[PDB]
Amino acid sequence: VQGLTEEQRMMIRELMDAQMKTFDTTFSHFKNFRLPGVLSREEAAKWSQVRKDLCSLKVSLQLRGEDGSVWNYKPPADSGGKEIFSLLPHMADMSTYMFKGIISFAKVISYFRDLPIEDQISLLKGAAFELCQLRFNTVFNAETGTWECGRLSYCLEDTAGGFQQLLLEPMLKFHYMLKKLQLHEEEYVLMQAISLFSPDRPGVLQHRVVDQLQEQFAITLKSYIECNRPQPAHRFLFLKIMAMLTELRSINAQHTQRWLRIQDIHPFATPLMQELFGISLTERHKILHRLLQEGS
Amino acid sequence: GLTEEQRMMIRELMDAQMKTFDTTFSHFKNFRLPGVLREEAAKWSQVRKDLCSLKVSLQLRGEDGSVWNYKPPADSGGKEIFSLLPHMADMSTYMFKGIISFAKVISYFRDLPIEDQISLLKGAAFELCQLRFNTVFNAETGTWECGRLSYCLEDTAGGFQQLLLEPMLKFHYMLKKLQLHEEEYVLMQAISLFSPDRPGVLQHRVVDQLQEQFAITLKSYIECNRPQPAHRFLFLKIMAMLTELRSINAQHTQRWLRIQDIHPFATPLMQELFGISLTERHKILHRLLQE
Incomplete structure (x- = not known):
């Protein structure tokens, strides 16, 4: 701590405080969610692409009850029909619940609250998926291929190629790679800040304020790693993290294209997802605007 | 072989079974499911013993190929023990309605006074449901395969021998081992249904003679359609299993009443069948039997 500047110690403290106040790790407040029921050449190519997008990210669901009970949902096998959409x-x-936690996270950060509201919208539109993925990595169990979200657990379905086959999916490889770095909470939340305060997000106007903010978060992260991470296993860790953030932005662009594909074939989005991913600003994004004006 | 009347007797029973036993449970729908989420202490502790003996997991196989599975909670002393009630x-209730319809198509049962129809159904409803459930019981997997629904016995520390301590599980394993035919199952159901010594029966002599005729038909069926020496005592084994079923039925009535007192769960039709003018006390059953 003494190795960091006082401004840098306050920055990590506010980011860590914001994370604790807005990250519902146990999903205890996630309720009223839908669940799978009890039960043309061009169009063929479009369906064929979507079938690969959803098959790569196939998971079973486990719903854990406060009483100790466990509901488990194993998805249908792909017969070429709309069963591929059972979990959408x-x-x-x-x-949407995760995105609302990310929005609240940003609202509590002084540096984000001060920015113009159209930039707040533009930065959240550009980073929502990325920060959601960063948070999901902190509950990812790489031994079991399971995101352990308290009352909900999502387990990757076993495939023919095994581990190697799943690593061909950039989203899954990211989670396995990032988990291997064994990052601290402080390093995760600084990653979130660097991603959030991206100057080159579409629609940003204060490109220069955001860029100066981003640089200070990165500098703080580098300083933290130097004052707390001395082992040879953590050599070049800062640069590794920065490289993973660059990979996360590429995975963010890939996800947007998968989302517009799946939305065209089988609309699934909530109103808040459509605002985040579906591009005057405040008027086109009425939910974000409201949430950003509301209190914490 | 069998007398013509005995063959007709079997044919009417088989007809009733075919018309009223939904073997695939395809018409069992809209059912509730476990949710996402000093003296009184003696009543509670006896109830915990009643529910722990028959712990099952629940599997729902979707038409799309998906599978929902429900592992029950462990007993933490709370009302989670009631999750599947x-x-x-x-x-x-669904099974009981099928049993009621089963009796109604049987000529010998319709010709009885309706109050005897009520008393016989109250006495045998649980037994006929268990006999039907035995026909969907997979003894290799300890699972009742009810169409898209499965109930699978949860593993005990003791193993198969600890389950056999529970009288109803032992019953299903023993009865399955006999490998009875459809006709033998339905004749068991008739013998159980036409029991003259059920509480409330008034035409004891008419019911007794009907039971004897069903039992003789079963005894004759076995002698004529099974290898004589190997199945010499099959009929008596079946009778012994019906005697044990009447004892399990008595135990189940007492368990049902205890659990109902602490944690009301019975449907209106179940309350009538289990004691919660005979016609005035059983107006749902009366309506179902008049239609």
């Missing part, structure tokens, strides 16, 4: 309604509700 | 109450 649930994943949209759960993603 | 609402579902079982719907399953029991």
